[PDB]
Amino acid sequence: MKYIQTEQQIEVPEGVTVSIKSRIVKVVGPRGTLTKNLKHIDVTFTKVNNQLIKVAVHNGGRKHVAALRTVKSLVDNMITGVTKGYKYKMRYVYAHFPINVNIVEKDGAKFIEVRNFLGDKKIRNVPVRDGVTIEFSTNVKDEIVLSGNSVEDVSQNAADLQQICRVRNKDIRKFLDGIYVSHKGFITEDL
Amino acid sequence: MSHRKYEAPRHGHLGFLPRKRAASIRARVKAFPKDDRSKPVALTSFLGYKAGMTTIVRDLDRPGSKFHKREVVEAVTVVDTPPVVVVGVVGYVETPRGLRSLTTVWAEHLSDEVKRRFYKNWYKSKKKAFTKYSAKYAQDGAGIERELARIKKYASVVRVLVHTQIRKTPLAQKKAHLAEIQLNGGSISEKVDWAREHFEKTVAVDSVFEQNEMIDAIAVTKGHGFEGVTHRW
Amino acid sequence: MSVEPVVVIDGKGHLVGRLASVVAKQLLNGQKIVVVRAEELNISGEFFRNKLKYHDFLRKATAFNKTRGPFHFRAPSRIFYKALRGMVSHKTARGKAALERLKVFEGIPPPYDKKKRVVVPQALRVLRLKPGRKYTTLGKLSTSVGWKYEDVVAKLEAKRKVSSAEYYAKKRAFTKKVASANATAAESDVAKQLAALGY
Amino acid sequence: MGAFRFHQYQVVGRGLPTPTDEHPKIYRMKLWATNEVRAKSKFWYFLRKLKKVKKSNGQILAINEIFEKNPTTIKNYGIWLRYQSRTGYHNMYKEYRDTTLNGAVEQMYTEMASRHRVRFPCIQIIKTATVHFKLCKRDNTKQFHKSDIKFPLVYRKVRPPTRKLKT
Amino acid sequence: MAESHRLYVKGKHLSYQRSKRVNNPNVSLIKIEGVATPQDAQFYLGKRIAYVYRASKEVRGSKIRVMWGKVTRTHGNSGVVRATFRNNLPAKTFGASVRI
Amino acid sequence: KFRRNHKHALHGTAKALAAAKK
Amino acid sequence: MSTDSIVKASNWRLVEVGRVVLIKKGQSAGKLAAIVEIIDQKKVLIDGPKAGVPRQAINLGQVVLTPLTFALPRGARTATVSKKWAAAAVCEKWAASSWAKKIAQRERRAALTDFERFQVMVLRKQKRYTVKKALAKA
RNA sequence: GCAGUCAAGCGUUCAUAGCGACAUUGCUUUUUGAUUCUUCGAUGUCGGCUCUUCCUAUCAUACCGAAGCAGAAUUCGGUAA
RNA sequence: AGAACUGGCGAUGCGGGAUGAACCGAACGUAGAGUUAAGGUGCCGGAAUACACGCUCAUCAGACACCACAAAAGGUGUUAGUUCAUCUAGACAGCCGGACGGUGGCCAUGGAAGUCGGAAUCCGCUAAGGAGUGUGUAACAACUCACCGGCCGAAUGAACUA
């Protein structure tokens, strides 16, 4: 029959500053800055001093509680994201054919280009959303590291790389060729 | 399927519906190319008359055939395309309800051309003595220019009032076919200016089109009259 | 506006079906009503289900064979106009005239500087709010249908921009013209006011 | 209160009957009702349910009604209930937070109705049984109210218009 | 809160005058029984007076024509009011009860 | 469990697959 | 670390005591009242200090709280309720002005059929006219 | 005619790659029957031709899932007119 | 299709129900005023954008009867209700963690010995350590689990019903 609801508060770390005006919040740290808009029914996720960020709600129902949990998760991700970063480590796999991967960051619209994917004459490329940065530390041509502050964007970009290479028409077990998420994502750094 | 076993595409398209008489003698282009490149020295369109057809021999290209290389014949339509007078800059603005014209900027000289503007374009062929074009209203380019200043504060994709000077050779007819031609190009302020420079003077085919370039042709078909299903559909 | 000759109505965040009920009834009252800010009206419910209903109506508008009607109306002023025809008795001459008395314009039509007004609790904020299976603006429905819309929002953006400027300077000048009471005043008279009404 | 909700009418009576050394014995059902129209009815339905009688064999001695004895306030009524849905009637013990016996009826009706299936034909119930605030077990609305009397918790709960002010 | 809103409500038609030279248009005189408060008339005026056109009884033309007035101005100022009619009323229905 | 989803995913509705397994 | 944050905010809550409430639609009328005792979220007992403000139990949510609060504590009865209005004061005064309230303000206006009273009304603008003038300066 | 449920059973082993009885609930109105509502001051028959518009329970093409998919021919199935 | 018992239609208007012989209200000389039935009150469309509450978010759905469809199966962790058990003595999700000894137990059979089939079921000491939960080999051959402990803190899951 429920609910009605009450406040939850999480302390903001010294490494993070947050600043909020309206429903849109900026979360700022040394890795960089992150903006999202939290807007929802009868919810506030407010900052009580630059000290605590608190979430409170007049109202509750099943729907609200589920939302509050997402809101509480997102924010924890933003805060950790600005200080720690999030990073995905991804590995190129190719059984026959060389996969030629670069990122055209400096000279063009930010995108990751893969060439000769499965012998494909046509280059397959997808953008990078947000300030997240990709470094491919080639070796033979195994390792990709994708690092950024915004958790959403980082996950999307890493995910985008995985979807581009996907071949739905043939069996996956048979054609290993692609890029796969080798990790999730992640620890902090002394650096 | 109740019938036919044994069912075929329907002869004759619904998009070229209605199969009806054109509104005008002269084709009118509904939309034009986009503002990608140089200014209104680049008129979006030009007009001409169909002379007939000829055939030409050319150095081909399509490497895949064995028949590729040497001279090969290709069909041509010849069209006589005289220098055309861009008389004026008409300003159409985008709003909600539709475009309405702010102005037309006139040159000093259309003289027989305005008589041709009077022909069907007004009506009656030397019928009873005039028809009229009002004269340049004691140097009131200022009226035209202040109205030009108005077009620059927004945006049709800047457009021009044009005519074909038909008298040149093949047509016994003298009368000009007035046209609305869009101007496309670079930034808007320079776009008004170039369009402005162009009206002062005639414009050739050399200014508009380069050779070999891809051109869309719009014209109005041969007229049968009234016809049955078999030839039509 | 609630008189006999005005009549200008604010569409911003109002309920489409609700605006149309009162609008029809006032046209039946014999007013000539100008419904303004057409793109900004909202009709509640998720867009997907709303678009599915309209999509069938578009699919209907694909035929008969013939030409000359039926129709599905692309645009926010047009959607709203369709809404009145259904709301009013479309059979009769009275009903027909009432329909001729509507004009719906998107953004603002040529200057009506005089304020467009909200109707007695017509607005979607309160009228959602438990809540909101989503809520859909007419401008959001019509981007998917096609474009009388594309030019209308383009003008809305320019109208709102121009007007927003005006309103800031207007308000500044008004509080300024106004500081009358920032109290002066008392002057026996204020006692008169308190009494004068009072008794 | 104003325009009822179902004041319980303590209807009493007899039976009252025949030339035999028998006679039926003395009864009560205290039934929740709107006045005498309902009063009669329930008695005949009770007389059908448990007893057996008749109409004529059941004789009504007297009627005494129902306002508020104890506080408006704050039983959270334990109700023994029966709801008719897609066949016959299924047993229920529903303990819900209420103000009072006037309220209890409405809150139960709304619960049979919405939740459980209910429609016209029904009737009602078997008993309503008061309970101590701390005792109250099943559970959602009341758990919060029990806590409120506690208090602190009233300082809680204090929530509903809350998002509205500014202070 | 309000304003008017409320239905109470009886009145009289005093008489409806369908009058020109061809110059003048049509007038209707209404006298509501006590009603509008002096205040309720004055802050307002534009209260719409709707009389239903029903069967009274025997066969009146029982039609789906619901009639709406409006008060133009008072003439009577505490009582009597001017009205005009626009529509079509049923047949010589001066007398008839005013109402929502 | 494992077998149920396999059959459903292959030919059932998505909603039909989930709940019983749960 | 001067000043802090901000937080989009603030604070109205008081379904309990202290919270003045404004009327919905009902009785043969309308008045002002406060929450003595809380039953549950839905049902609350509402009373007021003196006259005919009789205490009613209602399911509240159609019934809206007003911006005002007065200072007391939870658990009340008649004797306590009388003491509180007396101690608090200025609540009636706030009640007159304007915050969903406006009740006296509307009362003043409402009484005004006369000869004399109307003249007074004209006078207030005649006074506005001279202040407008006074603003103009000349 | 087609579908759904259940799943005995078969498929080397394996209910569900595929095949799938008994039983059972449906749906459609395009075969057949049933009827006798409509027309006996008159509805032109089958079939075919040709012209149109449609339907989805999709044979192919597009995108997809599964496989008893190594490739690869393929099988089954989803979305889809 | 063909009976019974009755009302209506036929031969019965008018009001309701989109239309509509037999559905509801209603049995009708005329005319008017009043007030009502049936049934309805966002607009079309009288007349409420009524009041107290609760569920639902599919546009379900605006439907007595009706060419008003929707079932078996009903999932179901949707919501609700019930019935039985477990929880501040600390359940539950997850993660983490521990195991000596009477002694590898009678029957039968090529062969059961924790775990093919088939018995009794006590006890040490004792955080705790079952003659054992599943995964085995011809049979024997490990490892986990039971049972027991922690990190967290508040409810919990199973059955039926609408």
Structural domains in chain E, sorted by start:
2-100 (2.40.10.190)
Say which residues have a Cβ less than 8 Å from residue G126's Cβ, sequence separation at least 6.
Answer: none
**Per the structure block, which two tokens stand in for D20?**
């035999």
CA closest to H55 C1', residue: B1
Contacts of E7 (CB under 8 A, 6+ apart): E100
- Angstrom distance (rounded) from CA B25 to CA A115: 54
d(CA B113, CA C28): 55
Buried b or exposed e, range G87-125, using 16+ CB within 10 angstroms: ebeebbebbeeeeebebbbeebeeebeeeeeeebbeeee
A128 and A181 housed in the same domain = yes
Please tell me the distance from the alpha carbon of residue D105 to that of residue D33, in angstroms, as a whole number.
10
The residues, ordered by sequence, that sit 6+ positions from B197 with a Cβ below 8 Å of its Cβ are: B41
Rounded Cα gap, residues G21 and G33, in angstroms = 5
Instruction: Identify whether the C-beta of residue B121 lies closer than 8 Å to the C-beta of residue B178.
Output: yes
Q: Which candidate from A4, A44, A49 shows the least CB-CB separation from G9?
A: A44
Indicate yes or no: CB of G5 within 8 angstroms of CB of A19: yes
CA dist., res. D134 & res. G116, Å (int) = 65
Are residues A132 and A145 located together in one domain of the fold? yes
Contact G111 C193 (CB under 8 A): no
Report the C-alpha gap between G57 and D1 in whole angstroms. 9
For residues E72, E74, E79 and E83, what is the CA-based torsion angle, rounded to 10 degrees? Answer: -30
Shared-domain flag, residues A107 and A96: yes
Return d(Cα A44, Cα D27) in angstroms, integer. Answer: 60
Same domain, A59 and A132: no
Topology of the domain comprising G14-96:
SH3 type barrels. (2.30.30)
The whole-angstrom distance between residue D26's C-alpha and the CA centroid of its chain comes to 23
Alpha helices per DSSP H over E1-100: 39-42
- Shortest alpha-carbon distance between residue A59 and chain D (Å): 7
**Helical H segments across chain D, by residue range:** 36-46, 101-114, 140-149
| Three-state DSSP class for residue G109 | helix
SS (H, E, C) chain A: CCCECCCEEEECCCCCEEEEECCEEEEECCCCEEEEECCCCCEEEEEECCCEEEEEECECCHHHHHHHHHHHHHHHHHHHHHHCCEEEEEEEECCCCCCEEEEECCCCCCEEEEECHHHCCCCEEEECCCCCEEEEECCCCCEEEEEECCHHHHHHHHHHHHHHHCCCCCCCCCCCCEEEECCCCCCCCCC
Cβ contact C129 with chain I strand, < 7 A: no
Q: What share of chain E is helix, strand, coil (3-state, %, to 5)?
A: 5, 25, 70
Q: How many CB atoms lie within 10 A of CB A37?
A: 9
The span from the CA of C34 to the CA of C115, in Å, is 12
Contacts of C44 in chain A (CB under 8 A): none
**Residue G102: C-alpha distances to residues D82, G24, G51, G94 (Å):** 50, 15, 20, 9
Q: Tell me how close the Cα of G101 comes to any Cα of chain E, in angstroms.
A: 11
Q: Per CB distance under 8 Å, which residues of B are interface residues toward C? A: 94-96
- Rounded CA separation D78/D136 (Å): 8
Given a contact cutoff of 8 angstroms between Cβ atoms, the answer to whether C28 and C87 are in contact is no
Which of A85, A109, A127 finishes a domain?
A85
Q: For CA atoms G82, G84, G90, G95, give the dihedral sign.
A: negative
Task: Let me know: does C181 contact G134? Beta carbons within 8 Å.
Answer: no
Token reading at A147: 């690092």
CA-nearest residue of chain D to G62?
D161
Structure solved via: cryo-EM
Touching G: which chains, 3+ CB pairs < 8 A? A, C, D, E
* Residue A50 vs residues A18, A19, A27, G85: alpha-carbon distances, Å: 7, 8, 11, 40
Whether cis (ω within 30° of 0) applies to the bond prior to B60 is: no
The answer to whether strand I lies under 7 Å from the CB of residue D138 is yes
How remote is the C-alpha of C183 from its chain's centroid?
Answer: 38
**What DSSP designation does G15 have?**
S
Instruction: Please check whether residues A5 and A46 belong to one and the same domain.
Output: yes
Could you tell me if A20 and A91 lie in one domain?
no
Instruction: Looking at the structure, tell me whether residues A93 and A76 fall in a common domain.
Output: no
CA distance C23 to C134: 25
Both tokens of C117, joined, read 């007004």
Do A116 and A61 sit in the same domain of this protein? Answer: no
Looking at CA atoms only, how far is residue B98 from chain C in angstroms? 9
What tokens does A122 get?
């046509």
Same-domain pairing of A54 and A107: no
Q: Does C152 contact B96 at a Cβ distance shorter than 8 Å?
A: yes
For residue B67, give every residue at least 6 positions away whose Cβ sits within 8 Å of its Cβ, in sequence order, or none: none
| Contact residues on chain B for C151, CB-CB shorter than 8 A | 94-96
Q: How many CB atoms lie within 10 A of CB D106?
A: 14
Query: In the numeric block, which tokens belong to residue D79?
Result: 């109700």
Q: Which H or E element spans position F3? A: helix F2-10
Does any CB of chain A come closer than 8 Å to the CB of residue G7? yes
Distance from the A58 Cα atom to the nearest Cα atom in chain D, whole angstroms: 6
User: Which of A32, A56, A85 finishes a domain?
Assistant: A85
Place of tokens 């309103």: C167
Q: Between the CA of C45 and the C1' of H3, what is the distance in angstroms?
A: 34
CA gap A71, A45 in Å, rounded:
8
Rounded CA Rg of chain B: 22
Return the amino acid letter for A19: S
Is A115 in the same domain as A65? no
3-state secondary structure of B183: strand
Q: Return d(Cα A41, Cα A61) in angstroms, integer.
A: 11
Contacts 24+ apart (CB under 8 A), C69-72: C72/C145
- The set of long-range contacts for D149-154, using a CB threshold of 8 Å and a minimum separation of 24, is D149/D74, D151/G74, D154/G16, D154/G17, D154/G38, D154/G74
C-alpha distance across the termini of chain B, in Å: 25
The answer on A41 and A60 residing in a single domain is yes
Q: How far is B18 from chain C (nearest CA, A)?
A: 10
Q: A33, A51, A85 — which closes off a domain?
A: A85
Pairing of strands C33-36, C102-104: parallel
Question: What phi and psi, each to the nearest 5 degrees, are found at residue A183?
Answer: -165, 170
Q: Which residue has the tokens 């776009």?
A: B191
User: What is the sign of the dihedral through the CA atoms of C77, C78, C79 and C81?
Assistant: positive
Q: How many helices (H) and strands (E) does chain D have?
A: 3, 6
Residues A110 and A181 grouped into a single domain: yes
The nucleotide lying nearest E10 (C-alpha to C1') is: I34
* Strand pairing class (A133-137; A143-148): antiparallel
Q: Which amino acid is at E80?
A: V
Judge whether C35 is closer than 8 Å to chain B, CB to CB.
no
Domain of residue A43, residue span: 1-85
What residues does B86 pair with on adjacent strands? B162
3-state secondary structure (DSSP) of residue C179: coil
Size of interface C-G (CB pairs under 8 A): 31
Quote the CA–CA distance of B147 and B101 in Å, as a whole number. 10
List, in order of start, the domains of chain C with CATH numbers.
3-149 (3.90.1180.10), 150-199 (1.20.5.4280)
B16 burial level (CB within 10 Å; 0-12, 13-18, 19+): exposed
In this complex, do C199 and G107 lie within 8 Å of one another by their Cβ atoms? no
Please state whether beta strands D89-95 and D78-84 pair in parallel, antiparallel, or not at all (unpaired): antiparallel
Nucleotides in I strand less than 7 A from protein CB: 14-15, 30-35, 42-49, 51-55, 57-59, 75-83, 161-162
Give the count of domains, chain A: 2
Distances (CA, A) of E55 to B123, B131, C162, E52, E89: 66, 71, 57, 9, 14
Residue of D nearest to A57 (CA): D163
Which chain E residue has its CA at the smallest distance from C3's CA?
E46
Nearest CA to A136 out of A68, A97, A88, A189 is that of A88
How far is E41 from E78, CA to CA, in rounded Å?
Answer: 8
Q: What is the resolution of this structure in A?
A: 8.8
Rounded to 10 degrees, the C-alpha dihedral B156/B98/B179/B13 comes to 120
Nucleotides of H under 7 A from a protein CB: 5, 16-18, 48-55, 63-67, 69-72, 77-78
Instruction: Note the Cα A88 to chain centre separation in Å.
Output: 9
Query: CB–CB of B103/B195 below 8 Å?
Result: no
